[PDB]
């Protein structure tokens, strides 16, 4: 009885774990009709 | 009597003013905070429009001579010197001088050279009005004073600017500053004040982007008995596994088209059904603060300090440009011209000193001017001189 | 800004020029208000009748005294002839400035904390408790997957949800709902509060026309 | 300042709250201390969500999270127009009431002269 | 008890498997009245 | 029975403990598309 | 006195300015980010309207002579040279020169040739105001300075531009730049600033299509 | 203006130097760009009359060729 309640985005350790995951797909990857070089293909910041 | 009984207190007026600022906008940091501003599309635009008219004013400049014959000869020599700097023009100087609207301060060094062959052989021109960038100055003490805080003896430049990848006496330097009194050597940048509003403006824009991305209204939710889900996880080669894999791909592709529909079993085990499909929605009330008008207030807050707030829709913007022009002209008329004439021993009375007049920033109205000449001309109050004729 | 201004007149003789032998003015030396005496800036007679001079702090003569009144040019505004320390135009504005600032602070924190439509997930506590005590159990793997999948849950071309439909009581075991304010939102409309206070501040300086012979031109003539 | 609309409220069984208060070195104490800091930082961003146990003991659930709102009707008096009436009330006595938008103000100055 | 909750579009592995499926039919294929070359006939990007 | 009701943000002791936590992530860190130096990377004030 | 006591610090003012930019808009990358912009129908349109009037202005150009008889003869020769470049016109030069609104910078090399037969036989024309594309320049150091960061000695062009599918002295090159002071050799492209807004504008349009 | 500065100050002085045409500063010719806004026929025609009816417009072929 230690991890009942989970709130996301309120810890730096958890935020970077998801952000740096190479398999993550987030909202900033919306390519649309056809891919463009103006939209990132990786979650982690350069 | 003839004796000073006080000091300007340059060295104290500064040291109070550095404390009373948020620490991201004190001298050694403001150089970075300026260039980390500008990349805001409202901050760049305000500075660009200001430089647009400053360059225009100092393009068609004129030198106004006195009445005596001596002044007319001096005015011609001044015009030659100001229009023949080796690799420099007053437009470039004006757009370098006007950088005190970003950093409160501007440093220009005067270098003189002798003429070898030309119309005025033997005299001294000005080679370059060498601009010293604020970023290359000393980060610790940029400006050095007396043993007391009374006056300024020179300006220090960092030793790291003499490398590829020292104190300059005050008599050789032309200082321009704005936003402060005569006792504030480091002038107040117009971006001081804006800073707090810029910090808020940015944060709000960030919330809008993430907020619009995360508004999953109408998302599809599916409920399936856990017997099927659990059987698939432990029996990859069972009929339950095939149907689960089909759902994971079919649901992703579920758009609206010519053949979109849903077919689910209608079994029931309790007050709730076994299978269901509903489209989610916010169970309550949405956001209230309307972040759109928050940003508009802060944008007008920033542009007002630069006099360019009219883009949110004689004027305020035209009067603001005149301030920058007059500051530059004071340094040009009172620091360079008297010294330039002294080197070529042209000593004149006060009333015979020529001066430089900047151009006009607003274009002349052809309709207004043409009918203004007639009204004056039809009465005879307009002199017959080539000066009037050349105006057409 | 400070109700007061001090300028000292210094005269010097001419060496060579058109008016050799006469006296110019060398500098109209500005004395900053900040470098003045913080205790008594202005000194009077034994009575409170007239002014004998102005005092400057001894800390202004350092790097990092009483000046007679006959040598000083005093300018002040906002008060009668009997108020040596004039009333700064920022007096009056001050209370309005204090409010204006506070309201702007509430708007920023208010917009950040308006978590409308946030995703909430309900899971039986048997799975949550088993994961906490058995890090190498199938429950632990699924819990770790949820903590990352839910963070990345945006809207796109493949967004959907699939949950078990088990039921134990009047309420279901698993559910997913988007929260919303259960009632009514804020009412005070802090936007118009700030606009009233901004016009309150600029009116004292005659520059209130930016909120849209004049008042602003007549105000400048006073200073001249 | 006091219009706490949309504030976050959390409900937790009192067994966990009471155990933490008397056992500072128990797993309940650690989770309670985590909630007191996580809930304070709960903003809206790229990773905001909530995950709660779904246990049920009675008609009401054990764990819940709701955003409060005014259960009824808000204020009615619209204090904004109250102030505007009183401001015009004050400036009229000085003849300077035109700022709320030969004249009255010019005629008033002639009296003092 | 490992795959109770499924969220779509939050993984690159799941996104490309659906995207590259030759049998997939998505919203960007709405031909309307009669087919036109302005609308793709395959789900995968070129 | 001593800590039934908890209200956040009404104590200086509780406010600064959360504020000065190096692992804390609050609303003033919304980097958005790509990181910019106009947004703090630490919760505590300078 | 007659002696400089400082440097323009060209080599430092640059190196601060490359750090204070998001990394997708530093020199060797901005060449790609410009052409991956433009394909936005609001960005193309802004540049196209700007070039519309620049070409118009430099079409009906005029040379204004002085008062003396010598100046009038010189003005006529100048007009002939500027209107008789082999394969080039000022409209083409103006629309090549104005590319600094996209990349902060523009390089033109002056080539002179002798006249064989004509009205001014024996004199020197200008053959071509040869435009050097920003994309064909050196991606590492485009502009080379003194041993100090005081002045510019020339401009470097990549060796890969001499192939089908070197340092040019400064005295032969006409440099145009905008958006910066005299100490910024690589001028600030007007697309710097726009960039963050363009990134957002695109993302939102993508959400509308999938949302509908 | 940026283009004209390079054209007036970098090419013309060098071009005249090659053909040894050395002139004083006041005698250097310069290139003037065209006008980007078209002339208003209504405005211009009635502007000439108002100046012309008083006699402030010189009689030169420069004025005549403007029509």
UniProtKB/TrEMBL annotation, chains A, E, F:
<protein>
    <submittedName>
        <fullName>Uncharacterized protein</fullName>
    </submittedName>
</protein>
TrEMBL record, chain D:
<protein>
    <recommendedName>
        <fullName>Portal protein</fullName>
    </recommendedName>
</protein>
């Amino acid at each position: 009885n230690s991890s009942l309640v989970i709130i996301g985005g309120v810890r730096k350790d958890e935020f970077f774990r998801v952000k740096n995951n190479p398999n993550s797909y987030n909202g900033f990857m919306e390519q649309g009709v056809y891919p463009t070089p103006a939209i990132p293909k990786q979650s982690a910041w350069p | 009597r003839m004796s000073e009984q006080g000091t300007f207190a340059l060295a104290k007026v500064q040291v109070d003013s550095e404390r009373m600022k948020a620490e991201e906008i004190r001298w050694p940091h403001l150089i970075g905070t300026a260039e980390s501003m500008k990349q805001d599309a409202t901050v760049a635009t305000g500075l660009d429009m200001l430089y647009t008219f400053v360059e225009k004013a100092f393009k068609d400049f004129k030198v106004i001579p006195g009445e005596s014959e001596e002044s007319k000869k001096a005015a011609k020599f001044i015009e030659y010197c100001l229009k023949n700097m080796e690799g420099q023009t007053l437009r470039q100087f004006a757009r370098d001088a006007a950088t005190f609207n970003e950093y409160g301060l501007s440093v220009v060094e005067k270098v003189y050279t002798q003429i070898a062959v030309g119309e005025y052989v033997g005299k001294y021109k000005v080679k370059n009005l060498a601009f010293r960038p604020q970023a290359s100055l000393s980060r610790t003490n940029p400006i050095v004073y007396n043993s007391d805080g009374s006056a300024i003896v020179g300006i220090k430049q960092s030793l790291s600017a003499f490398q590829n990848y020292v104190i300059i006496p005050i008599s050789r330097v032309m200082l321009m500053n704005t936003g402060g009194s005569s006792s504030q050597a480091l002038g107040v940048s117009p971006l001081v004040g804006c800073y707090r509003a810029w910090r808020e403006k940015i944060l709000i824009e960030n919330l809008e982007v993430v907020g619009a991305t995360k508004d999953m209204g109408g998302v599809i939710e599916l409920k399936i008995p856990s017997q099927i889900l659990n059987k698939a996880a432990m029996d990859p080669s069972s009929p339950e596994a095939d149907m689960v894999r089909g759902l994971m791909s079919d649901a992703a592709n579920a758009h609206s088209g010519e053949q979109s529909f849903f077919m689910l079993p209608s079994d029931t085990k309790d007050n709730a059904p076994q299978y269901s499909m509903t489209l989610k929605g916010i169970d309550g009330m949405g956001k209230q603060y309307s972040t759109a008008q928050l940003i508009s207030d802060r944008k007008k807050s920033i542009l007002d300090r630069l006099g360019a707030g009219f883009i949110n829709v004689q004027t305020i913007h035209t009067q603001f440009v005149q301030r920058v022009n007059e500051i530059i002209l004071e340094a040009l008329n009172e620091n360079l011209l008297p010294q330039l004439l002294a080197l070529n021993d042209i000593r004149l009375p006060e009333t015979e000193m020529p001066y430089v007049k900047a151009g006009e920033i607003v274009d002349v109205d052809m309709e207004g001017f043409s009918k203004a000449i007639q009204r004056i001309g039809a009465v005879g109050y307009l002199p017959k001189t080539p000066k009037v004729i050349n105006r057409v």
